[PDB]
């Protein structure tokens, strides 16, 4: 983490635009790792919600440490003082060296956010998205300097999940990409490198594998519970595909696979699943609603 | 295991035709679980190497006793004459298997259940020649059979309810966790895993990401104990290729089954994975 941090003298102040679960988790690990954080969202209620969740989580971790009760709360306040909030994007990004967008998955809203960002940030600022749902080319399409754009695809809960996929568009410069690799490593992650291809690595291989399982079930070849057992037991996976999809969220999996089906209409693997569609249309989204493939 | 074994009063004698690695491993766990076994192959040398490998595993009276339950026979007709269950583990050639089953049919008891362990063909293609298709099914084990707990128990369109119930009990009697599948290409495991591995190869081939970053992403992102290139090397590249080739030829309109250059090259070059010290990676 230090080898990386000390090789990015240029990157001291980070702005995260969007204050939901991912934005708040990215803010937490960025602060814990020693950078200054500005978390931005026009939604004040969301900003308050995030800072309470971060504060909780940081406090929680400190409790595991060895040390005096002062040593611990000292640790929490050092971390939290690196995090500031702002309800105006242009103000928030004015002194940022790296900006990470974690907003709603809507391409016009994101492009609008990036136009605001580039109007206000520093000339050599690096801009990034955490999206799972769009190509970096399509997010960056209006920017003046595409060579300082890339992707930082974390996984929820960000403080717990080690992996980080670091993405380059066709236009990302080598220097910007290398900086992004060092930032992922500085914040404690195991980075993997991917081009701007739908699904990067994890989702591109996992979501179609899940849909293939659903498809097997829908043809009537085997039951959901036998599928899951065969994969845990035959391949060592800790969750079968249906449990996995419930865990990720059905709405989450459908929405990604829907964007692929539409952009890549000739690719058989990306067809929607009558059954996924019907479960999401019913609000049976998986664990987070208590009910998807299975009940919880 | 006992709950199963004592509900199969009719199944005492098991014949296994083909004494390669899977037939020999099925012989071993079937002997260990209390059945009588006849191991049959027309290649006397193979039969010899199979009994030496088996005794080698089982050592690791108990060795003598376990062995006394396994007899060999280089004649498939006479080997199955007294068998209640016959399990075919022969080479992956459909004419050879149909000829074997033509032989077994002519000799076996009329109530005998007939099964294949094949990964490469549809049950209904293996059985296409058979007069009573209703006592036919699939017992798909995994190498090494003595260690691998899963067994996919497969029915055709013709397998009777009674035959299939017996097959599930057999799997359970021999210490396996059974799962049921219809006669579909790849059953459950290979149908999901082999295309996920090819998807991984294709991603590397397109130049999107490196082999080691793809494997690291799947271990860390999904908790998989091996990433897809590690797993393929473990299973064997020749094995993964041969099954996928079968699918690409039989289902020519399915994009997911299209062959891979890197794979073809690595197998055409004899780089078959862990078992040869080189596949995707070196060992």
Coordinates of C-alpha atoms in Angstrom, one line a residue:
Chain A
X1 CA 0.0 0.0 0.0
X2 CA 2.9 2.4 0.9
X3 CA 5.0 1.3 -2.1
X4 CA 2.1 2.6 -4.2
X5 CA 1.1 5.6 -2.2
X6 CA 4.6 7.1 -2.1
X7 CA 4.8 6.7 -5.9
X8 CA 1.7 8.9 -6.4
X9 CA 3.0 12.2 -5.0
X10 CA 0.6 13.8 -7.5
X11 CA -2.6 12.2 -5.9
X12 CA -3.4 13.6 -2.5
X13 CA -7.0 14.7 -2.6
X14 CA -9.8 12.4 -3.8
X15 CA -13.4 13.4 -4.5
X16 CA -16.2 10.8 -4.7
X17 CA -19.4 11.9 -6.4
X18 CA -22.3 10.0 -5.2
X19 CA -23.0 9.1 -1.7
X20 CA -24.7 5.7 -1.8
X21 CA -23.4 2.4 -0.6
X22 CA -20.4 2.1 -3.0
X23 CA -19.5 5.8 -2.8
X24 CA -19.5 5.7 1.0
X25 CA -17.4 2.5 1.0
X26 CA -14.9 3.9 -1.4
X27 CA -14.8 7.1 0.7
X28 CA -14.1 4.9 3.8
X29 CA -11.2 2.9 2.4
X30 CA -9.7 6.0 0.6
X31 CA -9.6 7.9 4.0
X32 CA -8.3 4.8 5.9
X33 CA -5.5 4.6 3.4
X34 CA -4.3 8.2 4.1
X35 CA -5.8 10.3 1.3
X36 CA -8.0 13.4 1.8
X37 CA -11.6 12.7 0.8
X38 CA -14.4 15.0 -0.3
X39 CA -17.7 13.1 -0.6
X40 CA -20.2 14.9 -2.8
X41 CA -23.9 14.6 -3.4
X42 CA -26.7 17.2 -3.9
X43 CA -28.8 15.0 -1.6
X44 CA -28.0 16.2 2.0
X45 CA -29.9 13.3 3.5
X46 CA -27.7 10.8 1.6
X47 CA -24.5 12.7 2.8
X48 CA -25.6 12.4 6.4
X49 CA -26.6 8.7 6.0
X50 CA -23.1 8.0 4.5
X51 CA -21.1 9.7 7.2
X52 CA -23.0 7.9 9.9
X53 CA -22.4 4.5 8.2
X54 CA -18.7 5.2 7.7
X55 CA -18.2 6.4 11.2
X56 CA -19.9 3.2 12.5
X57 CA -17.9 1.0 10.3
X58 CA -14.5 2.7 11.2
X59 CA -15.4 2.5 15.0
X60 CA -16.4 -1.2 14.6
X61 CA -12.9 -2.0 13.0
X62 CA -11.1 -0.1 15.7
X63 CA -12.6 -2.4 18.3
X64 CA -10.7 -5.4 16.8
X65 CA -7.3 -3.6 17.3
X66 CA -5.1 -4.0 20.3
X67 CA -4.5 -0.9 22.3
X68 CA -5.9 1.5 24.8
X69 CA -9.3 2.8 24.4
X70 CA -7.7 6.1 23.6
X71 CA -5.4 4.5 21.0
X72 CA -8.6 3.2 19.4
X73 CA -10.7 6.3 19.3
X74 CA -7.6 8.3 18.2
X75 CA -7.4 5.9 15.3
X76 CA -11.1 6.6 14.4
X77 CA -10.9 10.4 14.6
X78 CA -7.6 10.6 12.5
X79 CA -9.4 8.6 9.8
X80 CA -12.7 10.5 9.9
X81 CA -11.1 13.9 9.8
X82 CA -9.8 13.1 6.4
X83 CA -13.4 12.9 5.2
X84 CA -15.4 16.1 4.3
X85 CA -18.8 16.4 2.7
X86 CA -20.1 18.9 0.2
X87 CA -23.6 19.2 -1.5
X88 CA -22.3 21.0 -4.7
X89 CA -20.3 18.8 -7.2
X90 CA -18.3 21.8 -8.8
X91 CA -17.2 23.0 -5.4
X92 CA -16.3 19.5 -4.2
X93 CA -14.0 18.7 -7.2
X94 CA -12.1 22.0 -7.4
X95 CA -8.9 20.8 -5.7
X96 CA -9.4 17.0 -6.3
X97 CA -6.5 15.1 -8.0
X98 CA -8.6 12.1 -8.6
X99 CA -12.4 12.0 -8.9
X100 CA -14.4 8.8 -8.6
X101 CA -18.1 8.8 -9.7
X102 CA -20.4 6.4 -8.0
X103 CA -23.7 7.7 -9.1
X104 CA -26.9 6.2 -10.3
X105 CA -26.6 3.8 -13.2
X106 CA -28.0 6.2 -15.8
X107 CA -25.9 7.2 -18.7
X108 CA -27.3 10.7 -19.2
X109 CA -27.1 11.5 -15.6
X110 CA -23.5 10.3 -15.4
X111 CA -22.5 12.2 -18.5
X112 CA -24.1 15.4 -16.9
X113 CA -22.1 14.7 -13.8
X114 CA -18.9 14.4 -15.7
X115 CA -19.5 17.6 -17.6
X116 CA -19.9 19.3 -14.2
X117 CA -16.8 17.6 -13.0
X118 CA -14.5 18.6 -16.0
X119 CA -15.8 22.2 -15.8
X120 CA -14.5 22.5 -12.3
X121 CA -11.6 20.1 -11.6
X122 CA -7.9 20.7 -12.1
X123 CA -6.4 20.3 -15.5
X124 CA -4.4 17.3 -14.7
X125 CA -7.2 15.7 -12.6
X126 CA -8.0 12.0 -13.3
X127 CA -11.6 11.2 -13.7
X128 CA -13.1 7.6 -13.1
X129 CA -16.3 5.8 -12.9
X130 CA -17.2 2.8 -10.7
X131 CA -20.0 1.7 -13.2
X132 CA -20.9 -2.0 -13.9
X133 CA -23.4 -1.0 -16.5
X134 CA -21.8 1.1 -19.2
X135 CA -18.8 1.1 -21.3
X136 CA -16.2 3.7 -20.3
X137 CA -16.2 5.0 -23.9
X138 CA -19.9 5.7 -23.6
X139 CA -19.5 7.5 -20.2
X140 CA -16.5 9.6 -21.4
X141 CA -17.9 10.4 -24.8
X142 CA -18.4 14.1 -24.1
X143 CA -15.2 14.8 -22.3
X144 CA -12.5 17.3 -23.5
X145 CA -9.6 15.1 -22.3
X146 CA -10.4 11.4 -22.7
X147 CA -6.8 10.4 -21.9
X148 CA -7.3 11.2 -18.2
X149 CA -10.5 9.0 -17.8
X150 CA -10.6 5.4 -16.6
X151 CA -12.6 2.9 -14.5
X152 CA -12.3 1.8 -10.9
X153 CA -14.7 -1.1 -10.4
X154 CA -14.9 -2.0 -6.7
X155 CA -17.1 -4.6 -5.1
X156 CA -19.5 -4.2 -2.2
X157 CA -18.9 -4.0 0.8
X158 CA -15.9 -2.0 -0.3
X159 CA -14.1 -2.1 3.1
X160 CA -14.2 -6.0 3.0
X161 CA -13.7 -6.8 -0.7
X162 CA -10.1 -7.1 -1.8
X163 CA -10.6 -7.1 -5.5
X164 CA -10.6 -4.0 -7.7
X165 CA -10.8 -4.1 -11.4
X166 CA -8.9 -1.2 -13.0
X167 CA -10.2 -0.4 -16.5
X168 CA -8.7 1.5 -19.4
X169 CA -10.9 2.9 -22.3
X170 CA -9.4 3.0 -25.7
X171 CA -8.4 6.6 -25.0
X172 CA -6.8 6.3 -21.4
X173 CA -3.2 7.3 -21.4
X174 CA -0.5 4.9 -20.1
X175 CA 0.4 7.4 -17.5
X176 CA -3.2 7.7 -16.3
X177 CA -3.6 3.9 -16.2
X178 CA -0.5 3.5 -14.2
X179 CA -1.7 6.0 -11.7
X180 CA -5.0 4.1 -11.4
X181 CA -3.2 0.8 -10.8
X182 CA -1.1 2.5 -8.0
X183 CA -4.2 4.1 -6.4
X184 CA -6.1 0.7 -6.2
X185 CA -2.9 -0.8 -4.6
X186 CA -2.6 2.3 -2.3
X187 CA -6.1 1.7 -1.0
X188 CA -5.4 -1.9 -0.1
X189 CA -6.8 -3.7 -3.1
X190 CA -5.6 -6.5 -5.3
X191 CA -5.9 -4.9 -8.7
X192 CA -6.6 -6.7 -12.0
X193 CA -6.3 -5.0 -15.3
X194 CA -9.0 -5.1 -18.0
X195 CA -9.9 -3.3 -21.2
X196 CA -13.2 -1.6 -21.7
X197 CA -15.1 -4.7 -22.5
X198 CA -18.6 -5.4 -21.3
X199 CA -18.6 -6.9 -17.8
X200 CA -14.7 -6.4 -17.3
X201 CA -13.6 -9.8 -15.9
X202 CA -15.8 -10.9 -13.0
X203 CA -19.2 -9.9 -14.2
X204 CA -18.5 -11.0 -17.9
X205 CA -17.7 -14.5 -16.7
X206 CA -20.1 -14.8 -13.6
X207 CA -23.4 -13.3 -14.8
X208 CA -23.6 -15.5 -18.0
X209 CA -22.6 -18.5 -15.9
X210 CA -25.5 -17.8 -13.6
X211 CA -27.8 -17.2 -16.6
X212 CA -26.7 -20.6 -18.0
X213 CA -27.7 -22.2 -14.7
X214 CA -31.1 -20.5 -14.8
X215 CA -31.5 -21.6 -18.4
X216 CA -30.7 -25.2 -17.4
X217 CA -33.3 -25.0 -14.8
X218 CA -35.8 -23.4 -17.2
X219 CA -35.3 -26.3 -19.8
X220 CA -36.3 -28.7 -16.9
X221 CA -32.9 -30.6 -16.9
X222 CA -32.2 -30.3 -13.2
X223 CA -33.6 -28.6 -10.1
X224 CA -32.2 -25.4 -8.7
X225 CA -31.0 -27.1 -5.5
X226 CA -29.3 -29.9 -7.4
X227 CA -27.5 -27.4 -9.7
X228 CA -26.2 -25.5 -6.7
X229 CA -25.1 -28.7 -4.9
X230 CA -23.3 -29.9 -8.0
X231 CA -21.4 -26.7 -8.4
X232 CA -20.4 -26.5 -4.7
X233 CA -19.5 -30.1 -4.5
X234 CA -18.1 -30.6 -8.0
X235 CA -16.2 -27.3 -8.4
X236 CA -15.6 -26.2 -4.8
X237 CA -17.5 -23.0 -5.1
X238 CA -18.7 -21.5 -1.9
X239 CA -22.2 -20.7 -3.4
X240 CA -24.1 -22.4 -6.2
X241 CA -25.2 -20.1 -9.1
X242 CA -28.7 -19.5 -7.8
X243 CA -27.5 -18.6 -4.3
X244 CA -24.9 -16.4 -5.9
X245 CA -27.4 -14.5 -8.0
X246 CA -29.6 -14.0 -4.8
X247 CA -26.6 -12.7 -3.1
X248 CA -25.6 -10.2 -5.9
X249 CA -29.2 -9.3 -6.4
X250 CA -31.5 -10.4 -9.1
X251 CA -32.3 -6.9 -10.1
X252 CA -28.6 -6.3 -10.2
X253 CA -28.0 -9.3 -12.5
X254 CA -31.0 -8.6 -14.7
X255 CA -30.1 -5.0 -15.2
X256 CA -26.6 -5.8 -16.4
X257 CA -27.6 -8.7 -18.6
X258 CA -30.4 -6.4 -20.1
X259 CA -27.9 -3.8 -21.1
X260 CA -25.8 -6.5 -22.8
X261 CA -28.9 -8.1 -24.6
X262 CA -29.7 -4.6 -26.1
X263 CA -26.2 -3.5 -27.1
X264 CA -25.1 -6.9 -28.4
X265 CA -28.3 -8.2 -30.0
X266 CA -26.7 -11.1 -32.0
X267 CA -25.0 -12.7 -29.0
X268 CA -27.0 -15.7 -27.9
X269 CA -25.4 -15.9 -24.5
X270 CA -26.9 -12.6 -23.5
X271 CA -30.6 -13.4 -23.9
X272 CA -32.8 -12.5 -21.1
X273 CA -34.3 -15.2 -18.8
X274 CA -38.0 -15.5 -18.7
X275 CA -37.8 -16.5 -15.2
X276 CA -35.3 -13.8 -13.9
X277 CA -37.6 -11.2 -15.7
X278 CA -40.6 -12.5 -13.9
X279 CA -38.9 -12.6 -10.5
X280 CA -37.6 -9.0 -10.8
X281 CA -41.0 -7.8 -12.2
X282 CA -42.4 -9.3 -8.9
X283 CA -39.9 -7.5 -6.6
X284 CA -38.4 -10.8 -5.6
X285 CA -34.8 -9.4 -5.9
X286 CA -33.0 -11.9 -3.7
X287 CA -31.6 -11.7 -0.2
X288 CA -32.0 -8.0 0.1
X289 CA -35.8 -8.4 -0.2
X290 CA -35.8 -11.9 1.6
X291 CA -36.9 -13.6 -1.5
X292 CA -35.5 -14.4 -5.0
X293 CA -34.8 -18.0 -6.2
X294 CA -34.9 -18.9 -2.5
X295 CA -36.3 -17.3 0.7
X296 CA -34.3 -15.9 3.6
Chain B
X1 CA -25.0 -45.7 2.5
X2 CA -26.6 -48.6 4.4
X3 CA -30.1 -47.1 4.1
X4 CA -29.4 -47.3 0.4
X5 CA -27.6 -50.7 0.2
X6 CA -30.3 -52.5 2.2
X7 CA -33.0 -51.2 -0.1
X8 CA -31.3 -52.7 -3.1
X9 CA -31.7 -56.4 -2.2
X10 CA -31.6 -57.2 -5.9
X11 CA -28.2 -55.6 -6.7
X12 CA -25.2 -57.7 -5.5
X13 CA -23.0 -58.0 -8.4
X14 CA -21.6 -55.1 -10.4
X15 CA -19.8 -55.5 -13.7
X16 CA -17.6 -52.5 -14.9
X17 CA -16.6 -52.6 -18.6
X18 CA -13.4 -50.8 -19.2
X19 CA -10.4 -50.7 -16.9
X20 CA -9.0 -47.3 -17.5
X21 CA -8.8 -44.7 -14.8
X22 CA -12.5 -44.2 -14.2
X23 CA -13.5 -47.9 -14.5
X24 CA -10.7 -48.8 -12.1
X25 CA -11.8 -46.1 -9.6
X26 CA -15.5 -47.1 -9.8
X27 CA -14.3 -50.8 -9.3
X28 CA -12.5 -49.6 -6.1
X29 CA -15.4 -47.7 -4.5
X30 CA -18.0 -50.3 -5.5
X31 CA -15.8 -53.1 -3.9
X32 CA -15.2 -50.9 -0.8
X33 CA -18.9 -50.4 -0.3
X34 CA -19.8 -54.1 -0.1
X35 CA -20.6 -55.2 -3.7
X36 CA -19.1 -57.9 -5.8
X37 CA -17.2 -56.5 -8.8
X38 CA -16.2 -58.0 -12.1
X39 CA -13.8 -55.7 -14.0
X40 CA -13.9 -56.4 -17.7
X41 CA -11.6 -55.3 -20.6
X42 CA -10.4 -57.1 -23.8
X43 CA -7.0 -55.7 -23.2
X44 CA -5.3 -58.0 -20.7
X45 CA -2.5 -55.5 -20.1
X46 CA -4.9 -52.8 -19.0
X47 CA -6.6 -55.2 -16.6
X48 CA -3.2 -56.0 -15.1
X49 CA -2.3 -52.3 -14.6
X50 CA -5.8 -51.6 -13.2
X51 CA -5.6 -54.3 -10.5
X52 CA -2.0 -53.0 -9.5
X53 CA -3.2 -49.4 -9.2
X54 CA -6.3 -50.4 -7.2
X55 CA -4.5 -52.5 -4.7
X56 CA -2.0 -49.6 -4.5
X57 CA -4.8 -47.1 -3.6
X58 CA -6.6 -49.4 -1.2
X59 CA -3.5 -50.2 0.9
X60 CA -3.4 -46.5 1.8
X61 CA -6.8 -58.3 5.6
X62 CA -8.7 -55.1 4.6
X63 CA -6.4 -54.8 1.5
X64 CA -6.7 -58.6 0.7
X65 CA -10.5 -58.7 1.5
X66 CA -11.2 -55.5 -0.6
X67 CA -9.3 -57.1 -3.4
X68 CA -11.1 -60.5 -3.1
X69 CA -14.3 -58.6 -4.2
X70 CA -12.7 -57.7 -7.5
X71 CA -12.3 -60.3 -10.3
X72 CA -11.2 -59.5 -13.9
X73 CA -12.3 -60.9 -17.1
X74 CA -11.1 -60.2 -20.7
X75 CA -14.4 -61.3 -22.2
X76 CA -17.3 -58.8 -22.0
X77 CA -20.0 -61.4 -22.7
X78 CA -19.1 -63.8 -19.9
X79 CA -18.2 -60.9 -17.5
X80 CA -21.7 -59.6 -17.3
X81 CA -23.6 -62.9 -17.3
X82 CA -24.2 -62.8 -13.6
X83 CA -24.3 -59.0 -13.2
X84 CA -27.2 -57.0 -11.6
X85 CA -25.7 -53.7 -12.7
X86 CA -23.3 -53.0 -15.5
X87 CA -21.4 -49.8 -15.7
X88 CA -19.6 -49.0 -19.0
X89 CA -16.4 -46.9 -18.7
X90 CA -14.9 -47.7 -22.1
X91 CA -13.1 -45.4 -24.5
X92 CA -15.1 -42.4 -25.8
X93 CA -16.1 -43.8 -29.2
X94 CA -19.8 -44.2 -30.0
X95 CA -19.5 -47.3 -32.3
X96 CA -17.3 -49.1 -29.8
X97 CA -19.8 -48.3 -27.0
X98 CA -22.8 -49.5 -29.1
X99 CA -21.0 -52.7 -29.9
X100 CA -20.1 -53.3 -26.2
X101 CA -23.8 -52.8 -25.3
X102 CA -24.8 -55.1 -28.2
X103 CA -22.5 -57.7 -26.6
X104 CA -23.8 -56.9 -23.0
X105 CA -27.4 -57.2 -24.2
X106 CA -26.9 -60.6 -25.7
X107 CA -25.5 -61.9 -22.4
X108 CA -26.8 -60.1 -19.4
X109 CA -29.9 -61.0 -17.3
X110 CA -33.1 -59.6 -18.6
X111 CA -33.6 -57.5 -15.4
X112 CA -30.0 -56.2 -15.4
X113 CA -29.6 -52.4 -15.3
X114 CA -27.2 -51.0 -17.9
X115 CA -25.4 -47.7 -17.4
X116 CA -22.6 -45.6 -19.0
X117 CA -20.2 -43.1 -17.3
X118 CA -19.6 -41.2 -20.5
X119 CA -19.0 -37.4 -20.6
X120 CA -19.0 -37.3 -24.4
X121 CA -22.2 -38.7 -25.7
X122 CA -26.0 -38.5 -25.1
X123 CA -27.4 -41.6 -23.2
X124 CA -30.0 -41.9 -26.0
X125 CA -27.2 -42.2 -28.6
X126 CA -25.3 -44.8 -26.5
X127 CA -28.4 -46.8 -26.1
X128 CA -29.8 -46.4 -29.6
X129 CA -29.3 -50.1 -30.4
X130 CA -30.9 -51.6 -27.3
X131 CA -34.0 -53.7 -27.2
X132 CA -35.0 -52.7 -23.6
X133 CA -34.1 -49.0 -23.3
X134 CA -36.0 -48.7 -20.0
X135 CA -33.3 -50.4 -17.9
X136 CA -30.7 -48.0 -19.2
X137 CA -29.3 -44.9 -17.5
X138 CA -26.1 -42.8 -16.7
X139 CA -23.7 -42.9 -13.7
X140 CA -21.4 -39.9 -14.1
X141 CA -18.6 -40.0 -11.6
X142 CA -15.6 -37.8 -11.3
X143 CA -11.9 -38.6 -11.2
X144 CA -10.4 -39.6 -8.9
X145 CA -13.5 -41.7 -8.2
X146 CA -12.5 -42.7 -4.7
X147 CA -12.1 -39.1 -3.5
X148 CA -14.8 -37.2 -5.5
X149 CA -18.1 -37.2 -3.6
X150 CA -20.4 -36.0 -6.4
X151 CA -22.2 -38.4 -8.8
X152 CA -24.6 -37.2 -11.4
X153 CA -27.3 -39.7 -11.9
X154 CA -28.8 -39.3 -15.5
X155 CA -32.0 -40.6 -17.0
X156 CA -32.9 -40.8 -20.7
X157 CA -36.4 -40.4 -22.0
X158 CA -36.8 -44.2 -21.8
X159 CA -35.3 -44.9 -18.4
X160 CA -38.1 -46.2 -16.2
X161 CA -39.0 -44.7 -12.8
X162 CA -37.9 -48.0 -11.2
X163 CA -34.5 -48.2 -12.9
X164 CA -33.8 -44.5 -12.0
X165 CA -34.7 -45.0 -8.4
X166 CA -32.3 -48.0 -8.2
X167 CA -29.5 -45.8 -9.8
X168 CA -30.0 -43.1 -7.2
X169 CA -29.8 -45.8 -4.5
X170 CA -26.7 -47.2 -6.0
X171 CA -25.0 -43.8 -6.0
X172 CA -25.9 -43.3 -2.4
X173 CA -24.8 -46.9 -1.5
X174 CA -21.4 -46.3 -2.8
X175 CA -20.9 -43.1 -0.7
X176 CA -21.8 -40.5 -3.2
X177 CA -23.9 -37.3 -3.0
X178 CA -26.2 -37.8 -6.0
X179 CA -27.8 -35.1 -8.2
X180 CA -30.4 -35.8 -10.9
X181 CA -30.1 -34.6 -14.4
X182 CA -31.8 -35.3 -17.7
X183 CA -30.0 -36.5 -20.7
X184 CA -28.6 -33.1 -21.8
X185 CA -25.2 -32.3 -23.1
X186 CA -22.7 -31.9 -20.2
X187 CA -25.4 -32.8 -17.5
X188 CA -24.9 -30.2 -14.8
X189 CA -21.2 -29.8 -14.0
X190 CA -19.5 -29.9 -17.3
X191 CA -22.3 -28.0 -19.0
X192 CA -21.7 -25.1 -16.7
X193 CA -18.0 -25.3 -16.1
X194 CA -16.6 -26.1 -19.6
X195 CA -18.2 -23.1 -21.3
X196 CA -17.2 -20.8 -18.3
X197 CA -13.7 -22.0 -18.9
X198 CA -13.9 -21.3 -22.7
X199 CA -15.4 -17.9 -21.9
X200 CA -12.3 -17.3 -19.9
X201 CA -10.0 -18.4 -22.7
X202 CA -11.9 -16.2 -25.2
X203 CA -11.4 -13.2 -22.9
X204 CA -7.7 -13.8 -22.8
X205 CA -7.7 -14.5 -26.6
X206 CA -9.5 -11.1 -27.4
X207 CA -6.6 -9.5 -25.3
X208 CA -9.0 -8.1 -22.6
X209 CA -7.1 -9.4 -19.6
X210 CA -4.2 -11.6 -18.7
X211 CA -4.5 -15.3 -17.7
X212 CA -3.3 -14.7 -14.2
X213 CA -5.5 -11.6 -13.6
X214 CA -8.6 -13.6 -14.9
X215 CA -7.8 -16.4 -12.4
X216 CA -7.1 -14.0 -9.6
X217 CA -10.4 -12.1 -10.3
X218 CA -12.4 -15.3 -10.0
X219 CA -10.8 -16.5 -6.9
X220 CA -11.1 -13.1 -5.1
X221 CA -14.4 -12.0 -6.7
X222 CA -16.3 -15.3 -6.4
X223 CA -14.3 -17.3 -3.8
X224 CA -13.5 -20.0 -6.3
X225 CA -10.7 -22.2 -5.1
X226 CA -9.1 -22.3 -8.5
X227 CA -9.5 -19.7 -11.4
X228 CA -10.7 -21.0 -14.8
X229 CA -7.2 -21.6 -16.4
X230 CA -6.0 -23.4 -13.3
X231 CA -9.1 -25.5 -13.3
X232 CA -8.8 -26.4 -16.9
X233 CA -5.2 -27.5 -16.4
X234 CA -6.4 -29.6 -13.5
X235 CA -9.2 -31.3 -15.4
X236 CA -7.0 -31.7 -18.5
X237 CA -7.1 -29.6 -21.6
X238 CA -7.5 -32.6 -23.8
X239 CA -10.5 -33.6 -21.8
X240 CA -12.0 -30.1 -21.9
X241 CA -11.4 -29.8 -25.6
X242 CA -12.7 -33.2 -26.5
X243 CA -16.0 -32.6 -24.8
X244 CA -16.5 -29.1 -26.3
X245 CA -15.6 -30.4 -29.8
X246 CA -18.4 -32.9 -29.4
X247 CA -20.8 -30.1 -28.6
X248 CA -19.6 -27.8 -31.4
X249 CA -20.1 -30.6 -34.0
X250 CA -23.5 -31.7 -32.7
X251 CA -24.9 -28.2 -31.9
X252 CA -23.3 -26.2 -34.8
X253 CA -25.6 -23.1 -34.4
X254 CA -24.7 -22.5 -30.7
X255 CA -22.2 -19.7 -30.4
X256 CA -21.1 -20.8 -26.9
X257 CA -19.6 -24.0 -28.2
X258 CA -17.3 -22.6 -30.8
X259 CA -13.8 -23.9 -30.6
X260 CA -10.8 -22.0 -29.3
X261 CA -7.4 -21.5 -31.1
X262 CA -5.4 -21.3 -28.1
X263 CA -7.0 -24.5 -26.8
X264 CA -6.6 -26.3 -30.1
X265 CA -2.9 -25.3 -30.2
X266 CA -2.2 -26.4 -26.7
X267 CA -3.8 -29.8 -27.2
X268 CA -2.4 -30.3 -30.8
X269 CA 1.0 -29.6 -29.1
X270 CA 0.5 -32.1 -26.4
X271 CA 0.4 -29.5 -23.6
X272 CA -2.5 -31.0 -21.7
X273 CA -2.2 -29.4 -18.2
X274 CA -1.0 -30.8 -14.9
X275 CA -0.9 -34.3 -16.2
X276 CA 1.8 -33.3 -18.8
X277 CA 3.5 -30.4 -16.9
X278 CA 2.2 -27.8 -19.3
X279 CA -1.1 -26.5 -20.4
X280 CA -2.2 -22.9 -20.0
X281 CA 0.5 -22.8 -17.4
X282 CA 3.8 -24.8 -16.6
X283 CA 4.0 -27.2 -13.6

